[PDB]
Scaffold this active site. Sequence first.
Site, PDB file in Angstrom:
ATOM      1  N   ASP A 165     141.263  73.980 129.396  1.00  0.00           N
ATOM      2  CA  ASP A 165     142.672  74.274 129.567  1.00  0.00           C
ATOM      3  C   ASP A 165     142.862  75.627 130.222  1.00  0.00           C
ATOM      4  O   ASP A 165     142.947  76.651 129.553  1.00  0.00           O
ATOM      5  CB  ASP A 165     143.376  74.271 128.228  1.00  0.00           C
ATOM      6  CG  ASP A 165     144.849  74.535 128.362  1.00  0.00           C
ATOM      7  OD1 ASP A 165     145.497  74.788 127.334  1.00  0.00           O
ATOM      8  OD2 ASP A 165     145.361  74.491 129.500  1.00  0.00           O
ATOM      9  N   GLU A 190     132.426 104.400 133.656  1.00  0.00           N
ATOM     10  CA  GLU A 190     132.026 105.317 132.597  1.00  0.00           C
ATOM     11  C   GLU A 190     132.840 104.981 131.361  1.00  0.00           C
ATOM     12  O   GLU A 190     133.599 105.812 130.869  1.00  0.00           O
ATOM     13  CB  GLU A 190     132.319 106.759 133.006  1.00  0.00           C
ATOM     14  CG  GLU A 190     131.642 107.200 134.280  1.00  0.00           C
ATOM     15  CD  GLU A 190     131.965 108.633 134.641  1.00  0.00           C
ATOM     16  OE1 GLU A 190     131.195 109.225 135.424  1.00  0.00           O
ATOM     17  OE2 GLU A 190     132.984 109.163 134.146  1.00  0.00           O
ATOM     18  N   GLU A 195     134.170 104.573 127.679  1.00  0.00           N
ATOM     19  CA  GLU A 195     134.006 105.324 126.440  1.00  0.00           C
ATOM     20  C   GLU A 195     134.489 104.436 125.303  1.00  0.00           C
ATOM     21  O   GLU A 195     135.243 103.490 125.530  1.00  0.00           O
ATOM     22  CB  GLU A 195     134.835 106.609 126.486  1.00  0.00           C
ATOM     23  CG  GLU A 195     134.620 107.388 127.762  1.00  0.00           C
ATOM     24  CD  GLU A 195     135.309 108.737 127.768  1.00  0.00           C
ATOM     25  OE1 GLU A 195     136.548 108.765 127.623  1.00  0.00           O
ATOM     26  OE2 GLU A 195     134.612 109.764 127.928  1.00  0.00           O
ATOM     27  N   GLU A 221     130.349 111.525 123.036  1.00  0.00           N
ATOM     28  CA  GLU A 221     131.553 112.097 123.654  1.00  0.00           C
ATOM     29  C   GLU A 221     132.215 113.228 122.892  1.00  0.00           C
ATOM     30  O   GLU A 221     131.808 113.585 121.798  1.00  0.00           O
ATOM     31  CB  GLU A 221     132.599 111.018 123.934  1.00  0.00           C
ATOM     32  CG  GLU A 221     132.518 110.506 125.341  1.00  0.00           C
ATOM     33  CD  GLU A 221     132.911 111.576 126.340  1.00  0.00           C
ATOM     34  OE1 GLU A 221     132.442 111.522 127.495  1.00  0.00           O
ATOM     35  OE2 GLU A 221     133.701 112.471 125.966  1.00  0.00           O
ATOM     36  N   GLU A 229     129.629 107.158 125.017  1.00  0.00           N
ATOM     37  CA  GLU A 229     129.738 106.781 126.406  1.00  0.00           C
ATOM     38  C   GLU A 229     128.413 106.327 126.963  1.00  0.00           C
ATOM     39  O   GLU A 229     127.370 106.884 126.642  1.00  0.00           O
ATOM     40  CB  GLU A 229     130.249 107.960 127.221  1.00  0.00           C
ATOM     41  CG  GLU A 229     130.512 107.603 128.654  1.00  0.00           C
ATOM     42  CD  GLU A 229     131.118 108.755 129.418  1.00  0.00           C
ATOM     43  OE1 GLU A 229     131.270 108.631 130.650  1.00  0.00           O
ATOM     44  OE2 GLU A 229     131.444 109.788 128.794  1.00  0.00           O
ATOM     45  N   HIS A 253     136.570 106.011 133.491  1.00  0.00           N
ATOM     46  CA  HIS A 253     136.583 106.553 134.843  1.00  0.00           C
ATOM     47  C   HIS A 253     135.849 105.664 135.801  1.00  0.00           C
ATOM     48  O   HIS A 253     134.784 105.133 135.478  1.00  0.00           O
ATOM     49  CB  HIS A 253     135.936 107.922 134.884  1.00  0.00           C
ATOM     50  CG  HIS A 253     136.573 108.915 133.970  1.00  0.00           C
ATOM     51  ND1 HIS A 253     136.089 110.193 133.794  1.00  0.00           N
ATOM     52  CD2 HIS A 253     137.664 108.815 133.174  1.00  0.00           C
ATOM     53  CE1 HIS A 253     136.852 110.837 132.932  1.00  0.00           C
ATOM     54  NE2 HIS A 253     137.814 110.025 132.539  1.00  0.00           N
ATOM     55  N   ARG A 297     140.582 120.975 135.308  1.00  0.00           N
ATOM     56  CA  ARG A 297     140.646 120.601 133.904  1.00  0.00           C
ATOM     57  C   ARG A 297     140.621 119.096 133.659  1.00  0.00           C
ATOM     58  O   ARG A 297     140.079 118.640 132.641  1.00  0.00           O
ATOM     59  CB  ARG A 297     141.883 121.216 133.269  1.00  0.00           C
ATOM     60  CG  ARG A 297     141.799 122.719 133.126  1.00  0.00           C
ATOM     61  CD  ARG A 297     143.071 123.284 132.538  1.00  0.00           C
ATOM     62  NE  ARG A 297     142.866 124.631 132.014  1.00  0.00           N
ATOM     63  CZ  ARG A 297     142.731 124.919 130.720  1.00  0.00           C
ATOM     64  NH1 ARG A 297     142.778 123.954 129.798  1.00  0.00           N
ATOM     65  NH2 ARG A 297     142.556 126.179 130.341  1.00  0.00           N
ATOM     66  N   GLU A 344     136.255 109.497 142.297  1.00  0.00           N
ATOM     67  CA  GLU A 344     136.418 109.071 140.917  1.00  0.00           C
ATOM     68  C   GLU A 344     137.856 109.091 140.458  1.00  0.00           C
ATOM     69  O   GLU A 344     138.512 110.126 140.510  1.00  0.00           O
ATOM     70  CB  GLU A 344     135.566 109.961 139.989  1.00  0.00           C
ATOM     71  CG  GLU A 344     135.645 109.606 138.505  1.00  0.00           C
ATOM     72  CD  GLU A 344     135.017 110.663 137.584  1.00  0.00           C
ATOM     73  OE1 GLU A 344     135.489 111.821 137.587  1.00  0.00           O
ATOM     74  OE2 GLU A 344     134.058 110.332 136.848  1.00  0.00           O
ATOM     75  N   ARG A 384     140.122 108.950 137.398  1.00  0.00           N
ATOM     76  CA  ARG A 384     139.968 109.193 135.980  1.00  0.00           C
ATOM     77  C   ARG A 384     141.112 108.706 135.099  1.00  0.00           C
ATOM     78  O   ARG A 384     141.090 108.902 133.891  1.00  0.00           O
ATOM     79  CB  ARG A 384     139.768 110.687 135.756  1.00  0.00           C
ATOM     80  CG  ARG A 384     138.604 111.301 136.540  1.00  0.00           C
ATOM     81  CD  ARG A 384     138.430 112.803 136.294  1.00  0.00           C
ATOM     82  NE  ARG A 384     138.088 113.115 134.910  1.00  0.00           N
ATOM     83  CZ  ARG A 384     138.978 113.476 133.983  1.00  0.00           C
ATOM     84  NH1 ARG A 384     140.271 113.587 134.295  1.00  0.00           N
ATOM     85  NH2 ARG A 384     138.575 113.740 132.743  1.00  0.00           N
TER      86      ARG A 384
HETATM   87 MG   LIG Z   1     133.912 111.339 134.371  1.00  0.00          MG
HETATM   88 MG   LIG Z   2     133.488 110.747 129.800  1.00  0.00          MG
END
Ligand SMILES: [Mg+2]
Ligand SMILES: [Mg+2]
Lengths: 443, 443, 221
Positions: free
Chosen positions: A52, A131, A133, A188, A195, A244, A315, A332, A334
């Site tokens: 289905d 990546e 987490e 992490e 991660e 990411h 940051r 990348e 994020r």
């Molecule tokens: Mg990263």
């Molecule tokens: Mg990370």
Amino acid sequence: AKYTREDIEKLVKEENVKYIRLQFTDILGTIKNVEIPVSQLGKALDNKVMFDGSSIEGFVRIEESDMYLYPDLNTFVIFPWTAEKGKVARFICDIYNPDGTPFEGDPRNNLKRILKEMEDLGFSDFNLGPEPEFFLFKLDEKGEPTLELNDKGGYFDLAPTDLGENCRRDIVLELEEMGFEIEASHHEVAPGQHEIDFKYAGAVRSCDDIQTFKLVVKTIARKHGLHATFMPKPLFGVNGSGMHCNLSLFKNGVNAFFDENADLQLSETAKHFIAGIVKHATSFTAVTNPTVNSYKRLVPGYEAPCYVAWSAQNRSPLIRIPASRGISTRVEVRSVDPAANPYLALSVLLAAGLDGIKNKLEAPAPIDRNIYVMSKEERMENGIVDLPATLAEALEEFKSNEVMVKALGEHLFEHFIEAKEIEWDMFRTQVHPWEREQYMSQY
Amino acid sequence: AKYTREDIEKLVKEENVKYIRLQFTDILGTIKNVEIPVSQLGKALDNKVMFDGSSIEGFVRIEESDMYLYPDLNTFVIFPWTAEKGKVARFICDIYNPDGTPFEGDPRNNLKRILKEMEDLGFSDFNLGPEPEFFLFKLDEKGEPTLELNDKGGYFDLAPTDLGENCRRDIVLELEEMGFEIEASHHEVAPGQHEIDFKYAGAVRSCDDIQTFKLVVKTIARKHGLHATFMPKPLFGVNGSGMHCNLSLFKNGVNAFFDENADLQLSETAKHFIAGIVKHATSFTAVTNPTVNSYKRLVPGYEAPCYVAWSAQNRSPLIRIPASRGISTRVEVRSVDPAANPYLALSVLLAAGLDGIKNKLEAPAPIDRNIYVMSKEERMENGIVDLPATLAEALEEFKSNEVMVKALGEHLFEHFIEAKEIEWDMFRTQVHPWEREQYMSQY
Amino acid sequence: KHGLHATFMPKPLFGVNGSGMHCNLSLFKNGVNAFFDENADLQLSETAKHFIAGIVKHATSFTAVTNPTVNSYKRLVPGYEAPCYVAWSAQNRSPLIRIPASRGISTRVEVRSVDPAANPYLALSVLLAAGLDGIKNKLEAPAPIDRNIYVMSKEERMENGIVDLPATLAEALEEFKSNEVMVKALGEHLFEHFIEAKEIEWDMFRTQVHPWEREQYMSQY
Ligand SMILES: [Mg+2]
Ligand SMILES: [Mg+2]
Ligand SMILES: [Mg+2]
Ligand SMILES: [Mg+2]
Ligand SMILES: [Mg+2]
């Protein structure tokens, strides 16, 4: 081709497979499947196994409609932990309509379509280095999830010493036996957070592994008395979990993002890519951050993207550009989180990227200066827009963007919006304890 | 004048008052106060009693600033339940700056200003007939609030039979002894919900009683082992609590809304009033529904306003017009809730109303047909706008309206927005159990 | 053995999907699917059409057998992908009869009203009986009802060839007792004891006082 139909038939016989799962993904990114006995493999390889297909729309489905299941022999895997009594193997499939044509509502299909847009533009492959987490919690007596974290490790600490547990190690080992080439893993920032990063791989393949990865993580974790979760932000006050996405476009087998002679060694193609994502970022957030809670992670102070901007070092830029260059040159994003539908997320990102490349969109200036110390006003003067604060806002924006909407398909789009729309309504009409702890006595 | 300074001095002596509370309201509508011994009455009537007026800004205050307290002898009351050891009386005051001028940040002042705009327009008085609703819950061992409702009565049922409890009756009796002229009371739709309606009264006076009312309700209720709450929506799934506001403009001592000869017996003045509220409704919602939870009540299916529209009979119009006519002719705004700051709520409503009267704004056509069965699209074709779904949305709209913003005062406005803005942020950055019950295992 | 308990109860939990045992049927004549027809409307032979007619005729009558328990009718409620009205379609929210996409020797009529509480042999007896009743009498099949029945008023729903299934075990039993072929489909001895069993069963349920009743009346009255 990695596996010829004969290679499979010989593998199921030799490896004594007894159970075959024909897995796939629905619109919500949830991993679905239809298990068949090993004595059904024949009808399976023949693409004659039906199911289905309205199940692809998730809890929004209205009427059941017969649909076909076409297994991808390249994705054949044998889950190592299952053994003895009966070995279990899987086969990620493609949904096909009764007539023989691909179902427009299948996410894995949408990705191929967008990928076809990429090839028609002169590009060979589109890689992805995720990546993901996740957090691990303890199980109580009834085996239910708890707010108790498995450890107390920090960012890159020697998480769970090599004991009999160390769920993070064990998952990586299990994946390796399954043919998963992992780059590396680590503990992490937040306690109980982990991660695992894979090596880059083609779009569909990488997304296939992200689906299989979650399954393996959640499965192995439950064997260790733990509970794995890719929820964007489980606990308030602590770091959230993102997934990411390091992207890189290839042309004729060469990283089209690398330009040794160019500044920062980034080619014109690469800079246009950036422009693409910068132009559609606020619009594809509803896809890359599909849940309500996804936006509880998109708050300042936890190293997660809050404003559309890119740099080499900051940051927490929406778009980051790793040091390594050459064949590794990559962009990348994020903002994406693990709750996102891997296939739908790439579809949208690729479209945003390919958008800039075609229309030669000009990329803005990098932002290396601290942006989290500026006011919303000071942010404007610098042309720094904010990402959607709620699923509701992300949905209105997404519907405003013509390209992003066309990046999913009339069918998928329609259903996605319907589901999320209902999701938000439930959440907003709900009365949370916080509201009572704050108003019950005060008013 | 209801009480001359001598009448008071004689009342405090004869009634053996021992404690005098000089109460007032802050920006959040919270009832504040500064209690003085009876031996301080002198300095009190002299308006020489000082206090930290920065307390009017609530949890947003930054620096303490000395301010005066001017008692209104007309509001002198003696709480009957307090007795023996020492009798307690109150005095609603007006905040005055050290120099002698009224503080622009005081809500009760803002109302007088707007009321002055009304008189300068040729109007005598502006009446208000509130209908505050509230829930009563049981107290546990530690005397803390519980989700347990005091009864199981329905809409207009014989709530809590005449026993020793019947908190609703007891409150009405206590108010009557205090000089409160109540119209009637009854059990509300939801279990544990109650309502008490007062007779109409001038703007400032009516708001003064709404403040005193909440105090009395919460106080008497705590004596009965119960816990009273004017929270817009305590329990999900059950009815919320509103504080409908029946308004009526007077000119030369005559209901300016009544026109026997005119259709529906509503004068031109009245119809323009309606236009005023219809034009600013979505803008003054942030004031009439100041809390986050306020919008959890503004959801369909609970007899609460969700779209801007008015009629004589409907499922739940934003503006309703009672049957009774003549001197009782009046317009009822049903969006307002009991969490709203009574003074700030009237200020905004009066301004919206006086807006239409001055600019002769034309009122739309009534909507008697069921509006809750129409789609957002079908709603547009009929020109039916929706009210703000969240405090966040209500705030952006409120800031867009020049008249509504000027209806509060630069000072008050500034602080109101700051407080609410912080209120929303906390709420949105928060991770509620609902989000975990919905995503923890699914993702 | 897994520390669990399997249940085929039609509806063990309120407000949650019940369990059904859809039955995909297919008739063969000379080892060939008599339900398939290459060149035919929706590729469905006449025999197939007639079979659908036979089921549509006795649907409300064999419900008592395919849904033998009292609880079987708490499943037969709108909103849970369970048949609530007599109608056949190929694509709908929840039809009583459904004809799957596939054709060839896979051509079949699916009856979705049957639940796992039914006695397999008895369930097939009435179903096959009703289906043969249509073929032998060449009953005319009604128009396939696509559209959406779960939004049509009851009057309107009846204005068209659409009747709702029995609401309770009692309603189903009476209907079943009035259908001659359905009765002769079980056998004098089977029919007798069956009716007895369910009537005694239903009576127990009707005389009982459920907690729901006290929760709703104990205080309001
Ligand atoms: Mg990263
Ligand atoms: Mg990370
Ligand atoms: Mg009321
Ligand atoms: Mg009312
Ligand atoms: Mg079925």
